[PDB]
Structures are given as structure tokens and as C-alpha cells.
Design a protein around this ligand. Structure first.
Ligand SMILES: [Mg+2]
Lengths: 97, 165, 165, 48, 236, 83, 66, 65, 165, 50, 36
RNA sequence: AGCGGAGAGGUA
DNA sequence: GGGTATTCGCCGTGTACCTCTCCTAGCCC
């Protein structure tokens, strides 16, 4: 099975899992360790931010693919904002200076 | 169901400039398209004869007539009748604006402004007019823009407006 | 290629009066071999009712369509149920599946030859060197003969070697 | 606080009020910036 | 998975779906009859089948088999096939626990298995309106509507493909032209949503089971299969 | 539920910072964090699909359910903002 | 029902009514050049719909991105 | 890829230079000698294009824009 | 905290798109830098590039007609898929990645099958057998990611082991 | 109000890549399908399948 | 999709052409198949 | 109509 | 006031994938 773009979860902006409902393959931690062992800054940045996590980033990358121009703008993952909102619910102030 | 459509066609939204004859022709054309989509052999025109202000719904088929037709539910026929109805309503509104432009009077027009783009403006006189510079009461009359409905063209500054004043 | 039976809708149902299933009848029809003299298509029908076995010789054949005597049975009938079955023969080569080509579909293996073996032996003949001979034992299903098989094999070789020059 | 005893490191950073300068490899994955190793060293050189 | 004869006797009445035995005076008032399952799905989406092996007019004893079950011979257990094996490296195609297959193991249909899938279409009741099983679906071409009947569902024994509409289901999603179209028709002109059952795996449809609730008017196909079931139980 | 005009605009967040500071939170700062006070432990009322006012799932505290819509339905336009 | 600019193109207008987006391209004189309707359930995905609207705005007279 | 590791010592600088040359070639420009990245690596390995010439072409494209 | 928390399941390891998995077989005819890829799998993975090339070639005015032409599966979409995949590397990954060389880049070719063919000199570094082994693939789509996969992730560049010489 | 269950029977053939094990624990995966003319044959002409 | 492409490498010493050698080989094989 | 928490079995 | 000597807790213990079922249901009419 394979997929290009399917449905996304609402708790965190990430694709689903499994052969059903067009789930994506989980890019594990050891694969991220191997890509960090390769170096590969631009490959690892476009893997866990642009393709998976960012809402506007995947739309901008998709329209830049179908338009022909090359202008990649990265952003913060939404799961980091979920973690910030979950830490702030524990009466602990976490600010992005 | 004869008066239930009579309470619908009698609205003054599209029957103020041109009366309910062309709306009846649009309804007859939509039901003829539905009967042609229901029948497997669609090569002749069907006549849906509806009388004036009574609403007797009867479907015929002329090939001069050959046989009778019969309606059905037709959800795809309902979608086809909807697009033929809105296309014929657009055609009738284009006919209404062009005959109100071309049969009332060809002379100076008086209206208020509605929109203003970069180097252009729109003058409302339910017809829309263009403001050429190459509320206002300029004297200019021309016919163009045959696709998307013909619209009248006035000007903000014209020598005919100075000659008439 | 295809089998058309009036009482059998799809290839997974059960018909009254038959001991085996429909898939056993389809495999037994795939097992038999049919030799046709002329033509690229044919249609054979069979009619067998009452108790008793159904062989390949019980079908109705044409003058050009020749059937092997068929000691292998097709199905087994028990009750007094009529079996009206229509077949279709087509020409081809190799193996064609049912996907890439109340109507049934059957696979076809267009290969009359089962196994080919050969061995090279030496022939004591007064010549300039040691000339060797070879023997080829062809085992078929009775459809094709061993002479026209190697004749069309040499024809295929001469048509394939015609690209050079 | 990435692999073991998240509560202890979290309450220590909450009491002391530490400031993470993001000079690492895993925290750039968490934040979402480039990795400061390999092809991403020029971006970190041009940033500072 | 196999049936066994409790009392031996004459098997003079035999069919592919049922086996009728006739007991003797020593074992016996009525005779015994064994019904065989033909094609039903298992728990692992596989096909189970019971094909008979006895003939017409042969005596048996207590304990003899009458129909071989799924993956079962005449009394031995059968899991696979028998085929020629050669232990030799062949051009790297059997490199590291890889298997090489010929054309003769494929063209004779030795490993062809039958899988039976369960696809359901559930018609819930919503607040805007109940979903129907009508066949008139907008924005659907006739090429996907030829296999549908007047009931809205597919026929029995129809070759479908991936993406084919098997059960046609619509749901209501809730300008003067729309009012004119709603008055010209019988309140079924527009405001509908297409949500039908599609095939995810191409094959034939072997059985269509329709479940209905009380207080709902039955469909003509449901009435037809009800007549078929009562004719079948009256016949047997 | 469904919105397509707001979905097209991008580059709204820059996400450019240097460090991350974590500290404690004063009760006045927690009061300045939130937008409303909850008082009832009712999330969703029975026999209707509508959120409960002043509950865990409320529109007066967190936000509306449907996009550019209220609970009653007095404002059903995209031009009304900040009202 | 008012055509609202999507704030991604200098010459673009959009209108959504029942999960159907009406996108039109206006001329600098004010006349609408082209107009098409794009559904949501036919695509089944978000960036494919974004790519469709972007390609329809780029091929049918996209002068600038302001 | 051995000649590309021969004309420059560092590998990541070669990756960044080939990325800049592929970004310049993908917008549409005449190459020095079919994919844009493969043509950029072939122009790098042939000692035809330099980083200063890449910066000059990028400055010319920024001035022309 | 924990393994199933919001820190280990959504921040370090994330689910990614443009990816799929399949079983692996052995391919002796392949080279070291290239590997096999199924036709439908590569059509599902390289779908945006296929859509962009179909928009550039002029075979479809909108992406809806291009999507219907992809699902119709004619020969032109195979020509587009063969022209796109020619110089585009993909990242093949083993499901355990304890090795440094668990992720390698290959130039895929289109095969008529349902599995991912692999060179026999690759599975030694992957420590992968050929009995029920599955490998997840990933495609880089940016130019920097493609050049990084060509330079420092190719199988021809990773000859020596990271542990010893 | 109504439930419709449709039984779909698919008959799948053998494909290159399918897992097939023996009787003593020697599992394997089919590499490719080879014609009969390329398979090794004995002295009598019987072609080996596997 | 299932088609075979044949590539033959010929290294002649130089007394005859390689295409001429392939042509005479095909002619010899054609005569040996046409005699039978 | 999409967003999920347990329990069981199986493969590498 | 101050050193051993137990002792109560705190915290952790591989990755990836594929099928299936079952989810708060209880009561006085
Ligand atoms: Mg293994």
C-alpha cells in the first residue's frame, strides 16, 4: 500500500496509520538518528515539518510542486504548539523568546 | 398541482421587465430536456404546452406528432432541468437588459455609481453600465459585449452631454 | 474460453441433479482438447439428461470440429435434470488468463504439446568427421501431429531469422 | 527531559527558570529548525 | 469440518447440496438427511466447502465420511500440493530463502484460492432525513449504473471491478430557481449527498442479504427474495 | 465546519525566535491567559447536538463550533468579525 | 453571497455556498473573464483543492501575487 | 561523484553549491555544457561553474526581478 | 512522559506521507545504484509530479480531468510516470534502523509486479532476508533533499562500514 | 432502518512476492514466474517446477 | 510489458565485418533449418 | 462524513 | 552529633507492520 496525501488527525496535524483509511508510514526515531548520522539538514527538515506537521507548509509545497517554482518556506510543527498548550495547563509558563 | 406553480412563477423578481411567457418557455424546455433524457432515443423536440395563468401540466412529443410522453422522478433529470433553467433565466435577463437598453430610448442616462475600479467605474441605472473616460448623467450610447449579456455603455465626459445641456 | 449455461448464473452456485460443482465441470472442460480444421471460432452445445456419466463424446460437433473420444468424464448426473450447456472455441497461442482478454469465463492453455525431450547420438558413417544425429520424442494430447508441429516450428524459426539481411 | 524522568527535569526548569539556547541536535528537531551538522552549519553560521 | 454417517445404509438419493441416507432395520422411524454447506465465509475471510465423495447405491458403516470438507481429502488432511524440487542455485533468483516458480504451476491453477469478503451498506436515520437506497443518483454516469437494478443494489452474479457502485445510497444534506425546481418536482429535486458502497479486489457477487426493520415498507427485491426463500423452504 | 476562503492565505506566522524560557505562573498571569470562567460540569446536552453554555465544551469561553457561525444563528456571514 | 478576495492573488474573487467555491477572474476594467465552480467531495483532499484553485487562477490570467 | 569530491574538499559545500545551481537551472537558464541536478553536478565536475559565478548569476536574476 | 505520550509518538517520530511499504524479492538483473518499484505504487507515490506533467503537456485543462485520466490508466500516464521517475531517487528504509546504513537512496525502475526488487549486494548492509520482509519507502521531493540523497545517501557512495574499515 | 450485506467472492491467483512456506519450516517469497522452456529438464523431458 | 531485448557483442579479428559475420551465421542457421 | 482507548492473534 | 544498616519508594525495561472485537449501561415502571 502507498499514499500521497490522505486524511489528517485533529488532535495533532499528522497523517493516520494502517492500511485502512490511507495511513502513512511512521518515520521512527531510529530513522531520524540515521538521517542525523548522514548529516542531511534539508532532508530532515522537509520530512517532519513540511510533509507531515505544518498545515500551510504542505499546501505551499504541493502548489509549488504542481506550479513548477521552487520556494520552500518551513514553519513550526503544530504538535509543538500542542505540547506548549499542554505544559501551560500545568500552571507552568513556557514562552517562545 | 396547477396553482402550486402559479404561486411560484407569479414572483416579481424576474417578471418585472419581461412577463412570464419566457419563464413558461424555460419550464417547457426544461421538461422537454427531462423527457428527452428519460427516453433512450432523443432526436426530436418535445412540446410541453402550458396555458396562460392556469398551469395545466401536459407533455407531448412531435417527431407531425408521433406519440405521447411520460414523466418520472429523474434526479439527474432534475439537475439537467436546473442547469437549463438557470441558463434560460440568464438568457432572458440578458434579453431584458438589451431590450430595455435598445427600445426605451437611445439618449442620456441618469444613474448612481456602485463600484469604482482603477481607472473605471460602474454606474447603476437592474442593469449595470460602464463609465468610460476616453452619480453621473453623461450622454453616450453604444452596443457591444455580446457574450455574458449585452450591457449599455455611458461616459463620464462626452461632447454630446455638453451639446444637450 | 467461455461456457454459457442457462440454469447456472455464476460459477459458485449449485445446480440440482449434478453431483459435482460448477468449478469441477469448468476444470473438466479445460482438461479436454478440441481439434478444429478451419475457422477461428466455433460454438458447441451438449444435451444430456437422466442418470449416468457425461463424457466429451456426448456433445454435438460440426463436420470440421473434431473431438477426441474423451475417456475422461465431465460431470456426473443423478436426477432427471436436463443439461443445456453452450461452449465456445477460439484460436490463440500461449497462455491467456480470464482477466486479460450470466456469462462465465474460463482460462485457456493453447498448448497441444506436453513434454519435449531430445538426445544426441553418434552415427557411424563414412564421412570427413564424426557426424552426430538426434532424436526428438514429442508427446501431445492427440490434437496436433508430430510432423506439422516441427513443420510450423521450422516455419517460426525461418520467420524469426528473416530479420537479418 | 527527553528520555527519562520528565517530571524532575520539568520541575527543576520551572523552579530555576532556565533558558534553552537551542544549541543541540534534538532540540532543533523539537523546535523545527535545521540540524546544526552537515548542510545546516552554514545556516547557523549566517544566523548568529 | 467433515460430515460422518451415524448409521450406515443406502445413499441412493444424493445431491451436491444434500445427502440422503436410508438406514436399515437394525439401526432404526424417519431416515437421516445431511445438509452440506457450499460457500460461506470463515473468520479469516477464506472459503469453506463440503463436496461429496460417495456414489449412488453403496452400503456403508457407522463412521464413514460422506463429504470432504475444506482443505480435506477423502479421509486424510491436505494442506498443499505436490511438485518437483531441485536444490540448485539458478541465476540468483533463489538467492536468500527465495522461491522459484515455473509457468506450469500457474497455468494449471494449483494455488488459486477463493476469498469471500463481507461488504455492508448501513442506512442510518439522521435529523435532516433518512437515507434511501434509491438508484437515481446525481453526478453518476450510466457506466456505473448498468449493473444496478431498480432496487438500487447490484445483481447476483455480476462481474464488478475496483470502484464500482454495488449499493446505491443517497442522503439528504438539506434564489427563485431553486424554489421553481422544488415546486416543479415532488420535493426530491436537489439538496442530496452521494454516499454509496464501493468496491475497495474484483470478483463476482454470490449472495445479497437484505435486512429490514419493522414498520418500514419492504422493497420489491426484498419481496422477491422473500418469495424465493419461502419457495425454497416449501420445496425442500 | 467547511471554509475555503480563509484556507488559501498563508505566511501568517513567522515562527522566528532565539531561545525558550520556562518559569512559574502567577495567578494573575493565569487569569490573563484565559478568556472565560467555567462553572458547570456539563459538556454536551442530551437529545440535541449543541454545546452547553459555561461548560467544558462551550462557545462563550473557547470558540464557536461551526466556522463563522453562532449558536443561535443571528450572524451567518463572513463579513461579520469581532462582533 | 458577496465575492470576497482570498488575499493571495491581486486578481481573484471567491464565493462559498454549500461547500461549492465559485472562483471568478475579473479584468482591470471590471468585467469577469472566466468563472467556474469547484466542489469539495469530488477531490477528497485539501492540497489537491488548493492546487486546483491555484492552477485555475494561474492559467486563466494571474498577473501578480499581491 | 568522485570528480565532484575532487574539485572541492567538503561534501556539504558541494551539496549547497549544487543546490544553488539546480535552483538557478530549474527556473530556466542555459547550462554551461537531462535533470537539473544531474546537469548541475556535471557542470561542477567539469570545472566550468564556480560559486562566484553562481553568486553573480543570482545577483543578475535579483536585479532583473 | 512515557512511550505513548505526546513527546515520543508525535515529536521525535511522526507519521509521514508520500510513503508506502511492500514486500521485497531479489533482483539479479539490477545494478547497485538502482532498485525495483511497482507500477501502481510508483503511480501513487509520484502522483503530484504526474499531475504537474499532465498539466504542462496539455492533456487535461483541470486537475479533475487529469485525475480521471490517471484512474482511467491509459498509456500516456505510463509515459508520464516513466519520464518522471527517470532521475528521481527514493529512500528505501528497513523497519528496524539500528544500522547507520538502514536508509539508502536508489533510482527506481518500473516493474510489472507487486513487490520491491532489491540488489543482492544491498541486503547484507540492511541485514534483511527474503521471507516476509517489508521495507518502507520514502520519496524526497525538494531539490535540496534530492541532491542530498544523490550525494550522501546513494548505495554506490556507502561502501565502507561505519564501525571498521 | 435498513441494512444491506453484499457477499463478494474473489479468486486470486499466485503472484511474484507471495509468501510460501514448506513443511519443515523453510519459508520463502516468490521472486518471479519463469516459463517452462527455461526450467531445467530431466533426461525424460519432465520440467522441474520449483 | 513482458518482452525480451537481445544485445550481442561481437569481437571479430578484422578479416570480416561483424554485421557480415552475423548475416552469414543467420544464413547458415536458416539453411540448416530449411534443409530439415 | 473525518479525529480513539483497551484486549487478542500473527510477521520480520 | 555521627558513622554504618536496613528500608520505603521512584523510575526505567526494542522497533516497524497486518487482522479481529468491544466499548457507562442501570432502573422502577
Ligand atoms: Mg526474515
Amino acid at each position: 500500500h502507498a499514499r500521497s496525501t490522505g486524511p489528517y488527525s485533529l488532535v495533532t496535524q499528522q497523517p493516520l496509520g494502517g492500511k485502512a483509511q490511507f495511513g502513512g508510514q511512521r518515520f521512527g526515531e531510529m530513522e531520524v538518528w540515521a538521517l542525523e548520522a548522514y548529516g542531511a539538514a534539508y532532508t530532515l527538515q522537509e520530512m517532519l515539518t513540511v510533509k507531515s506537521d505544518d498545515v500551510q507548509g504542505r499546501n505551499q509545497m504541493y502548489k509549488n510542486i504542481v506550479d513548477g517554482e521552487h520556494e520552500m518556506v518551513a514553519g513550526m510543527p503544530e504538535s509543538f504548539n500542542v505540547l506548549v498548550k499542554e505544559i501551560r495547563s500545568l500552571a507552568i509558563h513556557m514562552e517562545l523568546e | 398541482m396547477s396553482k402550486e406553480l402559479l404561486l411560484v412563477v407569479d414572483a416579481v423578481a424576474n417578471e418585472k421587465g419581461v412577463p412570464r411567457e419566457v419563464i413558461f418557455d424555460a419550464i417547457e424546455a426544461a421538461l422537454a430536456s427531462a423527457a428527452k433524457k428519460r427516453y433512450p432515443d432523443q432526436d426530436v423536440l418535445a412540446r410541453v404546452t402550458i396555458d396562460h395563468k392556469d398551469g395545466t401540466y401536459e407533455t407531448y412529443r412531435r417527431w407531425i406528432e408521433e406519440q405521447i410522453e411520460n414523466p418520472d422522478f429523474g434526479r439527474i433529470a432534475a439537475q439537467a432541468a436546473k442547469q437549463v433553467i438557470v441558463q434560460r433565466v440568464r438568457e432572458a435577463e440578458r434579453q431584458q437588459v438589451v431590450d430595455a437598453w435598445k427600445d426605451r430610448v437611445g439618449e442620456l442616462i441618469t444613474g448612481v455609481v456602485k463600484r469604482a475600479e482603477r481607472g473605471n467605474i460602474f454606474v447603476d441605472l437592474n442593469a449595470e453600465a460602464f463609465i468610460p473616460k476616453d452619480r453621473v448623467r453623461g450622454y453616450l450610447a453604444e452596443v457591444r459585449s455580446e457574450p455574458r449579456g449585452p450591457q449599455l455603455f455611458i461616459s463620464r465626459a462626452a461632447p454630446e452631454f455638453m451639446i444637450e445641456l | 474460453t467461455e461456457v454459457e449455461i442457462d440454469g447456472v448464473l455464476h460459477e459458485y452456485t449449485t445446480v440440482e441433479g449434478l453431483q459435482e460443482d460448477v468449478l469441477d465441470v469448468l476444470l473438466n472442460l479445460k482438461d479436454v482438447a478440441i481439434r478444429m480444421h478451419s475457422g477461428d471460432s466455433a460454438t458447441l452445445s451438449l444435451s444430456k439428461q437422466g442418470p449416468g456419466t457425461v463424457t466429451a463424446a456426448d456433445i454435438r460437433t460440426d463436420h470440421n470440429v473434431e473431438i477426441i473420444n474423451g475417456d475422461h468424464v465431465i460431470c456426473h448426473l443423478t436426477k432427471d435434470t436436463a443439461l443445456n450447456m453452450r461452449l465456445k472455441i477460439e484460436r490463440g497461442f500461449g497462455y491467456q488468463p480470464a482477466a486479460a482478454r450470466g456469462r462465465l469465463m474460463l482460462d485457456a492453455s493453447f498448448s497441444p504439446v506436453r513434454r519435449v525431450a531430445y538426445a544426441v547420438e553418434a552415427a557411424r558413417v563414412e564421412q570427413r568427421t564424426d557426424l552426430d544425429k538426434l532424436v526428438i520424442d514429442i508427446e501431445t494430447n492427440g490434437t496436433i501431429d508430430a510432423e506439422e508441429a516441427v513443420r510450423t516450428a521450422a516455419d517460426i524459426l525461418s520467420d524469426q531469422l528473416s530479420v537479418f539481411g | 527531559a527527553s528520555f527519562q524522568e520528565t517530571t524532575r527535569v520539568l520541575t527543576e526548569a520551572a523552579v530555576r527558570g532556565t533558558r534553552d539556547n537551542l544549541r543541540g541536535l534534538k532540540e532543533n528537531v523539537i523546535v523545527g529548525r535545521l540540524i546544526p551538522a552537515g548542510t545546516g552549519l552554514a545556516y547557523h553560521a549566517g544566523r548568529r | 469440518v467433515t460430515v460422518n454417517a451415524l448409521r450406515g445404509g443406502v445413499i441412493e438419493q444424493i445431491d451436491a447440496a444434500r445427502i440422503v441416507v436410508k438406514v436399515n432395520e437394525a439401526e432404526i422411524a424417519g431416515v437421516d438427511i445431511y445438509n452440506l454447506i457450499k460457500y460461506t465465509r470463515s473468520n479469516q475471510n477464506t472459503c469453506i466447502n463440503q463436496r461429496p465423495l460417495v456414489n449412488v447405491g453403496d452400503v456403508i458403516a457407522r463412521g464413514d465420511v460422506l463429504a470432504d470438507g475444506p482443505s480435506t481429502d477423502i479421509g486424510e488432511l491436505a494442506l498443499g500440493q505436490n511438485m518437483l524440487i531441485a536444490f540448485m542455485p539458478w541465476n540468483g533468483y533463489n538467492f536468500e530463502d527465495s522461491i522459484l516458480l515455473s509457468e506450469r504451476v500457474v497455468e494449471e491453477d494449483r494455488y488459486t484460492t477463493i476469498h469471500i469478503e463481507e461488504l455492508t451498506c448501513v442506512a442510518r436515520d439522521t435529523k435532516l432525513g433518512p437515507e434511501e437506497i434509491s438508484a437515481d443518483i446525481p453526478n453518476v454516469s450510466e457506466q456505473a449504473l448498468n449493473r444496478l437494478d431498480e432496487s438500487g443494489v447490484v445483481y447476483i452474479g455480476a462481474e464488478v471491478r475496483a470502484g464500482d457502485i454495488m449499493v446505491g445510497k443517497v442522503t439528504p444534506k438539506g434564489t427563485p430557481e431553486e424554489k421553481l425546481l422544488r415546486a416543479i418536482f415532488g420535493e426530491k429535486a436537489s439538496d442530496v449527498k452521494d454516499s454509496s458502497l464501493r468496491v475497495p479486489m474484483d470478483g463476482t457477487v454470490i449472495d445479497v442479504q437484505v435486512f429490514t426493520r419493522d414498520g418500514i415498507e419492504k422493497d420489491k427485491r426484498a419481496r422477491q427474495i422473500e418469495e424465493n426463500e419461502i419457495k425454497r423452504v416449501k420445496k425442500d | 465546519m467547511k471554509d475555503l476562503l480563509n484556507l488559501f492565505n498563508q505566511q501568517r506566522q513567522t515562527l522566528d525566535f532565539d531561545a525558550i524560557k520556562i518559569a512559574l505562573a502567577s495567578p494573575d498571569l493565569i487569569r490573563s491567559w484565559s478568556y472565560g470562567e467555567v462553572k458547570k460540569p456539563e459538556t454536551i446536552n442530551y437529545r440535541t447536538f449543541k454545546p452547553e453554555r459555561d461548560g467544558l465544551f462551550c462557545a462563550a469561553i473557547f470558540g464557536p463550533i461551526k466556522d463563522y457561525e453562532c449558536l443561535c444563528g443571528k450572524y451567518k456571514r463572513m463579513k461579520h468579525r469581532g462582533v | 453571497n458577496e465575492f470576497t478576495q482570498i488575499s493571495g492573488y491581486v486578481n481573484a474573487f471567491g464565493s462559498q455556498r454549500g461547500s461549492v467555491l465559485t472562483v471568478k477572474v475579473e479584468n482591470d476594467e471590471g468585467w469577469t473573464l472566466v468563472e467556474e465552480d469547484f466542489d469539495r467531495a469530488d477531490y477528497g483532499s485539501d492540497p489537491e483543492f488548493v492546487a486546483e484553485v491555484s492552477s485555475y487562477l494561474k492559467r486563466n490570467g494571474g498577473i501578480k501575487d499581491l | 561523484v568522485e570528480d565532484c569530491l575532487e574539485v572541492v574538499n567538503n561534501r556539504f559545500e558541494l551539496v549547497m553549491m549544487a543546490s544553488k545551481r539546480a535552483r538557478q537551472l530549474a527556473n530556466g537558464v542555459q547550462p554551461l555544457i537531462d535533470k537539473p541536478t544531474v546537469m548541475a553536478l556535471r557542470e561542477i565536475a567539469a570545472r566550468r561553474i564556480d560559486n562566484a559565478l553562481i553568486d553573480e548569476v543570482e545577483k543578475a536574476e535579483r536585479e532583473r526581478a | 512522559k512515557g512511550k505513548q505520550g505526546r513527546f515520543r509518538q508525535n515529536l521525535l517520530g511522526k507519521r509521514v506521507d508520500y510513503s508506502g511499504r511492500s514486500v521485497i524479492t531479489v533482483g539479479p538483473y539490477l545494478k547497485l545504484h538502482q532498485c525495483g518499484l511497482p507500477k501502481k505504487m510508483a503511480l501513487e507515490l509520484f502522483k503530484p509530479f504526474v499531475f504537474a506533467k499532465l498539466q504542462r503537456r496539455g492533456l487535461a485543462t483541470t486537475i479533475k480531468a487529469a485525475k480521471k485520466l490517471v484512474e482511467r490508466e491509459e498509456a500516456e500516464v505510463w509515459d508520464i510516470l516513466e519520464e518522471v521517475i527517470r532521475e528521481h531517487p527514493v529512500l528505501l528504509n528497513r523497519a528496524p534502523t539500528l544500522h547507520r546504513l538502514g536508509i539508502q537512496a536508489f533510482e527506481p525502475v518500473l516493474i510489472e509486479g507487486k513487490a520491491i526488487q532489491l540488489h543482492p549486494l544491498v541486503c547484507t548492509a540492511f541485514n534483511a532476508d527474503f521471507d516476509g520482509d517489508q521495507m518502507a519507502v520514502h520519496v524526497p521531493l525538494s531539490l535540496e533533499a534530492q541532491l542530498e540523497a544523490r550525494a550522501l545517501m546513494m548505495s554506490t557512495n556507502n561502501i565502507l562500514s561505519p564501525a571498521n574499515g | 432502518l435498513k441494512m444491506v450485506k453484499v457477499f463478494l467472492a474473489v479468486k486470486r491467483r499466485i503472484q511474484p512476492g507471495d509468501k510460501m512456506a514448506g513443511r519443515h519450516g523453510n519459508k520463502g517469497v516468490v521472486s518471479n514466474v519463469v516459463p517452462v522452456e527455461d526450467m531445467p529438464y530431466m533426461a525424460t523431458g519432465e520440467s522441474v517446477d520449483i
